[PDB]
Design an enzyme around this catalytic site. Structure first.
Site, PDB file in Angstrom:
ATOM      1  N   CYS B 105      -6.561 -36.305   1.513  1.00 15.70           N
ATOM      2  CA  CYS B 105      -5.600 -37.281   1.466  1.00 15.70           C
ATOM      3  C   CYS B 105      -5.398 -38.197   2.900  1.00 15.70           C
ATOM      4  CB  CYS B 105      -4.480 -36.362   1.402  1.00 15.70           C
ATOM      5  SG  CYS B 105      -2.686 -37.358   1.031  1.00 15.70           S
ATOM      6  N   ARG B 108      -1.419 -38.258   4.930  1.00 16.12           N
ATOM      7  CA  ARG B 108      -1.131 -37.182   5.524  1.00 16.12           C
ATOM      8  C   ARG B 108       0.033 -37.456   7.079  1.00 16.12           C
ATOM      9  NH1 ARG B 108      -5.854 -33.166   6.063  1.00 16.12           N
ATOM     10  NH2 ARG B 108      -7.389 -35.320   5.770  1.00 16.12           N
ATOM     11  N   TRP B 277       3.372 -42.448  -2.622  1.00 17.22           N
ATOM     12  CA  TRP B 277       3.293 -43.853  -3.048  1.00 17.22           C
ATOM     13  C   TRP B 277       1.752 -44.171  -2.894  1.00 17.22           C
ATOM     14  CZ3 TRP B 277       6.446 -42.638   0.950  1.00 17.22           C
ATOM     15  CH2 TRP B 277       6.118 -42.808   2.188  1.00 17.22           C
ATOM     16  N   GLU B 282      -6.297 -47.691  -4.692  1.00 15.21           N
ATOM     17  CA  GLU B 282      -6.456 -46.876  -5.591  1.00 15.21           C
ATOM     18  C   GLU B 282      -6.172 -47.631  -6.874  1.00 15.21           C
ATOM     19  OE1 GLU B 282      -4.311 -42.824  -5.074  1.00 15.21           O
ATOM     20  OE2 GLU B 282      -3.414 -44.226  -3.670  1.00 15.21           O
TER      21      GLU B 282
HETATM   22  C1  HEM Z   1       2.971 -40.778   0.681  1.00  6.12           C
HETATM   23  C2  HEM Z   1       2.046 -41.424   0.203  1.00  6.12           C
HETATM   24  C3  HEM Z   1       0.626 -40.784   0.010  1.00  6.12           C
HETATM   25  C4  HEM Z   1      -0.461 -41.662  -0.205  1.00  6.12           C
HETATM   26  C5  HEM Z   1      -0.546 -43.272   0.364  1.00  6.12           C
HETATM   27  C6  HEM Z   1      -1.571 -40.750  -0.637  1.00  6.12           C
HETATM   28  C7  HEM Z   1      -2.836 -41.357  -0.617  1.00  6.12           C
HETATM   29  C8  HEM Z   1      -3.768 -40.403  -1.186  1.00  6.12           C
HETATM   30  C9  HEM Z   1      -5.106 -40.925  -1.402  1.00  6.12           C
HETATM   31  C10 HEM Z   1      -5.559 -42.595  -1.513  1.00  6.12           C
HETATM   32  C11 HEM Z   1      -5.808 -40.052  -2.069  1.00  6.12           C
HETATM   33  C12 HEM Z   1      -7.180 -40.130  -2.846  1.00  6.12           C
HETATM   34  C13 HEM Z   1      -7.131 -39.570  -4.192  1.00  6.12           C
HETATM   35  C14 HEM Z   1      -8.209 -40.480  -4.727  1.00  6.12           C
HETATM   36  O1  HEM Z   1      -8.806 -41.607  -4.401  1.00  6.12           O
HETATM   37  O2  HEM Z   1      -8.599 -40.090  -5.981  1.00  6.12           O
HETATM   38  C15 HEM Z   1      -5.076 -38.693  -1.939  1.00  6.12           C
HETATM   39  C16 HEM Z   1      -5.633 -37.463  -2.377  1.00  6.12           C
HETATM   40  C17 HEM Z   1      -4.646 -36.220  -2.274  1.00  6.12           C
HETATM   41  N1  HEM Z   1      -3.408 -36.474  -1.987  1.00  6.12           N
HETATM   42 FE1  HEM Z   1      -2.379 -38.171  -1.056  1.00  6.12          FE
HETATM   43  N2  HEM Z   1      -0.982 -39.486  -0.657  1.00  6.12           N
HETATM   44  C18 HEM Z   1       0.327 -39.672  -0.388  1.00  6.12           C
HETATM   45  C19 HEM Z   1       1.013 -38.394  -0.412  1.00  6.12           C
HETATM   46  C20 HEM Z   1       0.861 -37.191  -1.004  1.00  6.12           C
HETATM   47  C21 HEM Z   1       1.713 -36.037  -1.178  1.00  6.12           C
HETATM   48  C22 HEM Z   1       3.380 -36.278  -1.130  1.00  6.12           C
HETATM   49  C23 HEM Z   1       0.844 -35.236  -1.644  1.00  6.12           C
HETATM   50  C24 HEM Z   1       1.564 -33.609  -1.995  1.00  6.12           C
HETATM   51  C25 HEM Z   1       2.480 -33.111  -1.535  1.00  6.12           C
HETATM   52  C26 HEM Z   1      -0.468 -35.480  -1.587  1.00  6.12           C
HETATM   53  C27 HEM Z   1      -1.633 -34.470  -1.961  1.00  6.12           C
HETATM   54  C28 HEM Z   1      -2.810 -35.028  -1.902  1.00  6.12           C
HETATM   55  C29 HEM Z   1      -3.963 -34.086  -2.359  1.00  6.12           C
HETATM   56  C30 HEM Z   1      -3.790 -32.758  -2.459  1.00  6.12           C
HETATM   57  C31 HEM Z   1      -4.973 -35.073  -2.771  1.00  6.12           C
HETATM   58  C32 HEM Z   1      -6.430 -34.377  -2.935  1.00  6.12           C
HETATM   59  C33 HEM Z   1      -6.843 -33.742  -1.729  1.00  6.12           C
HETATM   60  C34 HEM Z   1      -8.350 -33.011  -2.023  1.00  6.12           C
HETATM   61  O3  HEM Z   1      -8.591 -32.587  -2.995  1.00  6.12           O
HETATM   62  O4  HEM Z   1      -8.880 -32.604  -0.820  1.00  6.12           O
HETATM   63  N3  HEM Z   1      -0.524 -36.646  -1.137  1.00  6.12           N
HETATM   64  N4  HEM Z   1      -3.930 -39.154  -1.424  1.00  6.12           N
HETATM   65  C1  LIG Z   2      -6.528 -42.837  -7.483  1.00  6.40           C
HETATM   66  N1  LIG Z   2      -7.258 -41.580  -8.208  1.00  6.40           N
HETATM   67  C2  LIG Z   2      -6.124 -40.784  -8.456  1.00  6.40           C
HETATM   68  C3  LIG Z   2      -5.453 -39.887  -7.482  1.00  6.40           C
HETATM   69  C4  LIG Z   2      -4.187 -40.227  -6.943  1.00  6.40           C
HETATM   70  C5  LIG Z   2      -3.938 -39.277  -5.982  1.00  6.40           C
HETATM   71  C6  LIG Z   2      -2.723 -39.467  -5.260  1.00  6.40           C
HETATM   72  C7  LIG Z   2      -1.855 -38.798  -5.064  1.00  6.40           C
HETATM   73  C8  LIG Z   2      -0.737 -39.134  -4.334  1.00  6.40           C
HETATM   74  C9  LIG Z   2       0.411 -37.894  -4.007  1.00  6.40           C
HETATM   75  C10 LIG Z   2      -0.397 -40.469  -3.555  1.00  6.40           C
HETATM   76  C11 LIG Z   2      -1.350 -41.266  -3.973  1.00  6.40           C
HETATM   77  N2  LIG Z   2      -1.364 -42.411  -3.348  1.00  6.40           N
HETATM   78  N3  LIG Z   2      -2.428 -40.640  -4.548  1.00  6.40           N
HETATM   79  C12 LIG Z   2      -4.438 -37.973  -5.812  1.00  6.40           C
HETATM   80  C13 LIG Z   2      -5.589 -37.491  -6.414  1.00  6.40           C
HETATM   81  C14 LIG Z   2      -6.227 -36.545  -6.199  1.00  6.40           C
HETATM   82  F1  LIG Z   2      -6.503 -35.771  -7.621  1.00  6.40           F
HETATM   83  F2  LIG Z   2      -7.426 -36.430  -5.703  1.00  6.40           F
HETATM   84  F3  LIG Z   2      -5.450 -35.435  -5.750  1.00  6.40           F
HETATM   85  C15 LIG Z   2      -5.861 -38.571  -7.598  1.00  6.40           C
HETATM   86 CL   LIG Z   3      -4.155 -43.418  -9.853  1.00  7.04          CL
END
Ligand code: HEM
Ligand SMILES: CNCc1cc(-c2cc(C)cc(N)n2)cc(C(F)(F)F)c1
Ligand SMILES: [Cl-]
Ligand code: HEM
Ligand SMILES: CNCc1cc(-c2cc(C)cc(N)n2)cc(C(F)(F)F)c1
Ligand SMILES: C[C@H](O)[C@H](O)[C@H]1CNc2nc(N)[nH]c(=O)c2N1
Ligand SMILES: C[C@H](O)[C@H](O)[C@H]1CNc2nc(N)[nH]c(=O)c2N1
Ligand SMILES: [Cl-]
Ligand SMILES: [Gd+3]
Ligand SMILES: [Gd+3]
Ligand SMILES: [Gd+3]
Ligand SMILES: [Zn+2]
Lengths: 401, 401
Positions: B105, B108, B277, B282
């Site tokens: 993430c 964070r 958000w 993405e």
């Molecule tokens: C507030 C704005 C946030 C942004 C911009 C953001 C951004 C991202 C992005 C770009 C990813 C990669 C997912 C992908 O490309 O498939 C991700 C993954 C993830 N996000 Fe965030 N996120 C946000 C908030 C949060 C919140 C609020 C949570 C949970 C309470 C969270 C939990 C996670 C988890 C668990 C993953 C996958 C982590 C893993 O598998 O190691 N995110 N996030």
């Molecule tokens: C764009 N791919 C879909 C995808 C989006 C996100 C994600 C989750 C949150 C809270 C914010 C964000 N901005 N994105 C998280 C995951 C996963 F599964 F990895 F956690 C996958």
């Molecule tokens: Cl998405």
């Protein structure tokens, strides 16, 4: 055996080759350190034995008469001398395998097409320079670049190493400035200081080609200037941004890595410079746009009339794309081999497929294979990869100073 | 035993001492790195004890009255019932930690700002739907997005589980054809076929918002049409490419992952949808330009009159950048919170520095932190990272079929 998915297609393969991974990397089940840039006769014998096994497999004579003879020969020579000598065909095969095994190299579709120059009879730093000039001349080939390696004498007990102190055969000087900035390439500040400290008369341009510091065994390094006409350069222009030429930017034709150690069957060649041709993102993205390199991104975006006061205009991405276009256009205009990151990653996918059939896998370092711009637009982004160390190999080694 | 971690843009060095805590073994070994792979009875008390200690250190209350008392209550609770209930404040603190510990993430820096809806008293898919609906409307907040998680009841033995069958709360339909290929989002062809099979009437469009399949324990799922006024979407236009709007592209406001399992102190919440958000890449790079997703890249390049005949024109890179510009512009015009990959990665570097001081490191997955366009133009590219599993955490889980 690790299961490996391609997320674009759905393909699934198993990397059985990783099970033969000889040396150990930096990762454990506790923690992955994959993103880190830099992570006894009986053991010489087992490495040599394995490489000889590799060589006789490649010539479809595994377990044959000549195969045993060579194993016995090498053991006899290690017993008698503490080391052994590669046959010429073994050296050629081992150099190609080292390239083939190099996990961070996206250009490996070419691995079988490698000109191997045997300089293992090299005697001095002066002969070393002649060998290097001949390498540069052959590899450059007036812009139609040819992949080559020159192999200098192996490390051996009782004598020092041949070393090229320069990290590449062609490098631009980096001069610390009056204020504290660098003029030229900041990656080369240290080697530049060594060249001056070793009697080089520095210039003051941004693209001054460095001399070679060449070390014969148990010798201080010796300075050698490259004849200007041996170093093919490409002035950088952009096909539609005519002001781009006024940046006075240049880059050189030949990427020739000169500070890596070639390891074949337990033998070590600390001086074995190799060269291919550039992928345009190395120049356009990393060398020109890295903040700690030439760092031209903002100046280019400013000239492009982009709005640089906000990140969401994506001015950085737009300016970097045009710098890469300029690099590709300029090398093509100069008729100097270059590959863009799309062609290169597409050919690497074919390499992975060839290697899956050939060896059951392919050592690959995803973070280095995925290009530094437009990562997910290339097919390698969507390819899971298994990173591991096979020998023969190219290894990093400490700087000789 | 403490990994050295270098930032190559600045030269600065840190040590990840936090990695020494990694509970769940990752997929890597000294022999091979699997970092690029997307997806590689009283055990309950050890994780409960550990998590409770985390809570009381975080509030500077380790080794003092309420800490010990809480240690006994969980001890007595598990002894008496085989499990335990989290205090409100611990559910809160645990959700923020699982987010903080999410190595992939990039957002964070926001981990301290999370709204936790306690749905542990939930019972039935009708109850879920209004909880999910409360979340969506609070999180959406008329486009001023607010990070939120809704925690449905934990898992207990001998009884079925709460599950959301959709991977996200907002997903677009994927319809096969008279020719296998897909209209809409090919990522969701599977859940699209489950919804149709469970009674939903398929639309025809390329952006039909799917109905929710909500699963109360030991019951078949129930379809739920989301209130159309509660799914905030953004039509995509470009600030200067007037025809971009005519492409009819849209994306939704709220990224709300609804298939992941929240684990806190040994307890498992297979239904705990979290939302934040979007980062613009993405949508604009992965969702719209992946070959196996909406795959619009060539369609935009045709409209931009780009030379798609040669990869070295970098037409893919140019079209991609403009699609990302269109995403950012559209969301900003619709006043829907969005963050571009430059701001997001700069904030993550700030997060890394904060976490270094606070906890001595930070689990970060380089391949996912680095954005899918312009990777080396962002600072995280040049930051070495250490990846490992800390608890509490969000974990992937099998599909409930
Ligand atoms: C507030 C704005 C946030 C942004 C911009 C953001 C951004 C991202 C992005 C770009 C990813 C990669 C997912 C992908 O490309 O498939 C991700 C993954 C993830 N996000 Fe965030 N996120 C946000 C908030 C949060 C919140 C609020 C949570 C949970 C309470 C969270 C939990 C996670 C988890 C668990 C993953 C996958 C982590 C893993 O598998 O190691 N995110 N996030
Ligand atoms: C764009 N791919 C879909 C995808 C989006 C996100 C994600 C989750 C949150 C809270 C914010 C964000 N901005 N994105 C998280 C995951 C996963 F599964 F990895 F956690 C996958
Ligand atoms: Cl998405
Ligand atoms: C023919 C065209 C070639 C191309 C396009 C190419 C491409 C690349 C690129 C882009 C890198 C990463 C460099 C960086 O980002 O700093 C790399 C690394 C590397 N290349 Fe190639 N290369 C070519 C030829 C060769 C040859 C001829 C050899 C040796 C015989 C070789 C061996 C290596 C090695 C050892 C590395 C470092 C790998 C590691 O540490 O695992 N390459 N190559
Ligand atoms: C990008 N400039 C630095 C750099 C370039 C190359 C390289 C080498 C060759 C033969 C071709 C190419 N196109 N590139 C190899 C390395 C290293 F150190 F990994 F071996 C580093
Ligand atoms: C820290 C990070 O690993 C480092 O910047 C790496 C990432 N991937 C790379 N990939 C290539 N091809 N070349 C590089 O120099 C790097 N640098
Ligand atoms: C094969 C590769 O690991 C896979 O495509 C990963 C790479 N990095 C990623 N990074 C993010 N943020 N999201 C992703 O889906 C992926 N996919
Ligand atoms: Cl280079
Ligand atoms: Gd003009
Ligand atoms: Gd000026
Ligand atoms: Gd027209
Ligand atoms: Zn690893």
């Amino acid at each position: 055996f690790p299961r490996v998915k391609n997320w674009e297609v759905g393909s699934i393969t198993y990397d059985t080759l990783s099970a033969q991974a000889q040396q150990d990397g930096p990762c454990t089940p506790r923690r992955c350190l994959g993103s880190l840039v830099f992570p006894a006769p009986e053991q010489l014998l087992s490495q040599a034995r394995d490489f000889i096994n590799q060589y006789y497999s490649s010539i479809k004579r595994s377990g044959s008469q000549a195969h045993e003879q060579r194993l016995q020969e090498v053991e006899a020579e290690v017993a008698a001398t503490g080391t052994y000598q590669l046959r010429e065909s073994e050296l050629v095969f081992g150099a190609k395998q080292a390239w083939r095994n190099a996990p961070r190299c996206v250009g490996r579709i070419q691995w079988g097409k490698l000109q191997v120059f045997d300089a293992r009879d090299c005697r001095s730093a002066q002969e070393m320079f002649t060998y290097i000039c001949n390498h540069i001349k052959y590899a450059t080939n007036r812009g139609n670049l040819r992949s080559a390696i020159t192999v200098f004498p192996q490390r051996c007990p009782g004598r020092g190493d041949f070393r090229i102190w320069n990290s590449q055969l062609v490098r631009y000087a980096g001069y610390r400035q009056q204020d504290g900035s660098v003029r030229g390439d900041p990656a080369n500040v240290e080697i530049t200081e060594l060249c001056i400290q070793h009697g080089w008369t520095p210039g003051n341009g941004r693209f001054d080609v460095l001399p070679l510091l060449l070390q014969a065994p148990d010798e201080p390094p010796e300075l050698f200037l490259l004849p200007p006409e041996l170093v093919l350069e490409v002035p950088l222009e952009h096909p539609t941004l005519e002001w781009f030429a006024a940046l006075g930017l240049r880059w050189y034709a030949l990427p020739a890595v000169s500070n890596m150690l070639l390891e074949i069957g337990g033998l070590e060649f600390p001086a074995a410079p190799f060269s291919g041709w550039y992928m345009s993102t190395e120049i356009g993205t990393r060398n020109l746009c890295d903040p700690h390199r030439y760092n031209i991104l903002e100046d280019v975006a400013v000239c492009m009339d982009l709005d640089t006061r906000t990140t969401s205009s994506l001015w950085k991405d737009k300016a970097a794309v045009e710098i890469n276009v300029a690099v590709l256009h300029s090398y093509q205009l100069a008729k100097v081999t270059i590959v863009d990151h799309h062609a290169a990653t597409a050919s690497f996918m074919k390499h992975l497929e060839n290697e899956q059939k050939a060896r059951g896998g392919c050592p690959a370092d995803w973070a280095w294979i995925v290009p530094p711009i437009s990562g997910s637009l290339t097919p390698v982004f969507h390819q899971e990869m298994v990173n591991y160390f096979l020998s023969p190999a190219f290894r990093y080694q400490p700087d000789p100073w």
